[PDB]
Amino acid sequence: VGSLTINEERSEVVDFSVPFIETGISVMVSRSNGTVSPSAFLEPFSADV
Amino acid sequence: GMMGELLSGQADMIVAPLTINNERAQYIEFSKPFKYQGLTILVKKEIPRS
């Protein structure tokens, strides 16, 4: 028991029970400073207006 | 229903969004899930007209 992952080889060589938590691959990156959208003076309105 | 028709010998396999729980797995075997999900509540958009 523990944090063992269920893949094809391990499941073929060792019997596994039903999963109890979701797992997957996810990339982790640092915070990137964003930029403001240009032409912000036209935001509280519409071009049709 | 569908599980009752399966147990009665009508069909052999089931390809449908069937969940996994204890009561249904006590009688039939379930393979590894192909998609994970959960339960939530769906309501209508408020859209305040103040």
Swiss-Prot record, chain B:
Tissue specificity annotation: Detected throughout the brain, in brain cortex, cerebellum, thalamus and olfactory bulb.
Question: Where in or outside the cell?
Answer: Cell membrane; Postsynaptic cell membrane; Synaptic cell membrane; Postsynaptic density membrane
Q: Which domain of life is it from?
A: Eukaryota
Regarding how it is modified after translation, the entry says: NMDA is probably regulated by C-terminal phosphorylation of an isoform of NR1 by PKC. Its phosphorylated state is influenced by the formation of the NMDAR-PPP2CB complex and the NMDAR channel activity.
User: What residues bind glycine, as annotated?
Assistant: 17, 19, 24
Please give the function described in this protein's UniProt entry: Component of N-methyl-D-aspartate (NMDA) receptors (NMDARs) that function as heterotetrameric, ligand-gated cation channels with high calcium permeability and voltage-dependent block by Mg(2+). NMDARs participate in synaptic plasticity for learning and memory formation by contributing to the long-term potentiation (LTP). Channel activation requires binding of the neurotransmitter L-glutamate to the GluN2 subunit, glycine or D-serine binding to the GluN1 subunit, plus membrane depolarization to eliminate channel inhibition by Mg(2+).
| Quaternary structure (record) | Heterotetramer; the NMDAR subunits are modular and harbor tiered domains that function in concert to regulate opening and closing of the cation-selective ion channel pore. Forms heterotetrameric channels composed of two GluN1/zeta subunits (GRIN1), and two identical GluN2/epsilon subunits (GRIN2A, GRIN2B, GRIN2C or GRIN2D) or GluN3 subunits (GRIN3A or GRIN3B) (in vitro). Can also form heterotetrameric channels that contain at least two GluN1 subunits and at least two different GluN2 subunits (or a combination of one GluN2 and one GluN3 subunits) (in vitro).
Family note: Belongs to the glutamate-gated ion channel (TC 1.A.10.1) family. NR1/GRIN1 subfamily.
* Domain notes for this protein: A hydrophobic region that gives rise to the prediction of a transmembrane span does not cross the membrane, but is part of a discontinuously helical region that dips into the membrane and is probably part of the pore and of the selectivity filter. The extracellular N-terminal domain (ATD) is a site of allosteric regulation to modulate overall receptor function.
The name under which this protein is listed is: Glutamate receptor ionotropic, NMDA 1
Q: Which gene encodes it?
A: Grin1
Residue range from the parent sequence = 500 to 549 of 938
